[PDB]
Design a binder for this molecule. Structure first.
Ligand SMILES: Nc1ncnc2c1ncn2[C@@H]1O[C@H](COP(=O)(O)O)[C@@H](O)[C@H]1O
Ligand SMILES: Nc1ncnc2c1ncn2[C@@H]1O[C@H](COP(=O)(O)O)[C@@H](O)[C@H]1O
Ligand SMILES: [Cl-]
Ligand SMILES: [Cl-]
Ligand SMILES: [Cl-]
Ligand SMILES: [Cl-]
Ligand SMILES: [Mg+2]
Lengths: 305, 294
């Protein structure tokens, strides 16, 4: 149902962004007590969701793996309804998607340890093909976390070769220790992700905790050392710090905070949307923060802004 | 939060049944489309739930393992509301319970898989219980070591006079292989006084010629009372070499057979605990299941 536009050998009618990672079934409190609404979310998927709203004229694709059950079909449908191109989704027979439940104090429970999405880097050829004509390929530290050793290698090799042909690679380290076997493995693998990326979107609070960065500018230096060309350091309610080809700066973030979920994912979409438009980095960061600011004044992961 | 009665050295004021296995979170459709109601279920827990309803005068305990998150605490509270003694539940920090959505399942990493991790805790749960009930699902979710631990505790309990009841409850998807499944089920039979197989599932996997052959297979494993369920057909039984059949009264307006076996099992065990003859207990069990399927 989603319009993929047209193409010739040289150009496509639509700008193309690919997001790679895991989308999950989400059950969140409904109005009637004891009941829950079924939706879909997951960090990289949320970013794609916001992108589709920001640029409905563009092609926003999602690459992942789902099962073959009712719930998987439901997820596939929800993607199309959101204007997201799920044509590349791998189907893994006998399996289902990951799920999480929000209970309400607000708490989360996850069942994603055996999700189909963990097989998303099982087919190297399908990955390359998904990336081949993408203007931007976006992935996260959660994308890396859920894969085994071979899957990580396959994904990183694909991103690196895509990068070399001229795809712009964007990465949100999105540190979630509970998804990794150990902190050593997490930090190492995250920086492997950095080494294939042009744009990195770390969050200072998390980076400081695990890498021992003394401040946001030290966070930026760390990613620049891995070859990242544009580092954008998200910083809670504080100014966003950046570092691009040796040049530094800070972009003020106006004071606005119901729900800091989706903040980072919406920020990323706002940033990538503006970068694709050919806007200078500082302009893109301002747009990213403006979107995130309006989102954190909203209810949920997916806030119709 | 559930009264457990009183005791002296010789007798307890309440008869005591312990069920061992996995309780899961269940999400089922509510009226509002796209919304689901959260409840708790799972084979051995369902049997315990029905048993508690049938005998408010008794102590119905559940032994399992849960997590330490909000959902696990909700499960604990639901058990207590249902009159079930969850005082022996083990808590596995960082883990959560299994879940299913209406059937799609997430149970491969549930805390309940650790329920046989502490041998002393299992033995204490079984002490002074009159009946200990478990299923083939209880066995399926454990690793090899947990299986050995549980079976050894069950056999030791049986050696001390606890009555052991088993429902094979064959579920192929939960096992690594067909062979492992059949061998382990029969190991469960080997520690059980009472077995409650279902002919439809047994026949597909053991090659039983008919319900009497199913009964014979369990009897060779040392089961004293075998009660073979068979959908709407007569229940066959075998007890100490004596065969019999008990009719299942026809039910026309059938609605949901999911809890049929678990409610049958509770009905049977309730009547056995009351000292009713096996044929009487089977009829009581059929009657309850009949109401439940409607
Ligand atoms: N308390 C807040 N006040 C204003 N903006 C925020 C706040 N929290 C998050 N944001 C925005 O969301 C982005 C993501 O921040 P982070 O949560 O550190 O990933 C920030 O860079 C801001 O643009
Ligand atoms: N179609 C049916 N009509 C009447 N009773 C049933 C039916 N299905 C199941 N039951 C009852 O539930 C018990 C267990 O069913 P099953 O475990 O599916 O063989 C039977 O022994 C009957 O007492
Ligand atoms: Cl985490
Ligand atoms: Cl006393
Ligand atoms: Cl099964
Ligand atoms: Cl008898
Ligand atoms: Mg009664």
């Amino acid at each position: 149902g989603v319009d993929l536009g047209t193409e010739n050998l040289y150009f496509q009618s639509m700008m193309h962004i690919l997001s790679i990672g895991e989308c999950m079934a989400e059950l969140a409190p409904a109005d009637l007590p004891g009941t829950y609404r079924l939706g879909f979310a997951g960090d990289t998927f949320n970013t794609a969701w916001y992108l589709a709203r920001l640029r409905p004229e563009s092609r926003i694709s999602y690459f992942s793996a789902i099962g073959d059950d009712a719930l998987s079909q439901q997820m596939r449908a929800a993607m199309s309804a959101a204007g997201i191109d799920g044509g590349g989704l791998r189907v893994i027979p006998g399996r289902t998607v990951g799920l999480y439940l929000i209970t309400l104090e607000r708490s989360f429970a996850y069942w994603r340890g055996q999700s189909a999405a963990r097989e998303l880097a099982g087919d190297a050829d399908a990955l390359a093909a998904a990336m081949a004509r993408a203007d931007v390929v976006y992935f996260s530290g959660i994308t890396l976390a859920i894969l085994d050793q071979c899957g990580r290698a396959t994904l990183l090799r694909a991103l690196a070769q895509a990068r070399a042909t001229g795809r712009t690679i964007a990465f949100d380290p999105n540190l979630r220790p509970r998804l990794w076997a150990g902190t050593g493995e997490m930090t190492e693998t995250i920086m492997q992700g950095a080494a294939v990326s042009d744009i990195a979107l770390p969050s200072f609070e998390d980076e400081a905790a695990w890498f021992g960065d003394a401040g946001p500018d030290a966070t930026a230096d760390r990613y620049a050392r891995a070859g990242v060309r544009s580092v954008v350091v998200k910083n809670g309610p504080h100014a966003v710090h950046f570092l691009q080809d040796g040049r530094r700066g800070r972009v003020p973030v106006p004071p606005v905070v119901v729900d800091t979920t989706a903040a980072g994912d919406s920020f990323n979409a706002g940033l990538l949307d503006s970068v694709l438009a050919g806007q200078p980095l500082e302009t893109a960061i301002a747009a990213a923060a403006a979107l995130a600011g309006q989102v954190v004044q909203g209810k949920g992961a997916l806030v119709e802004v």
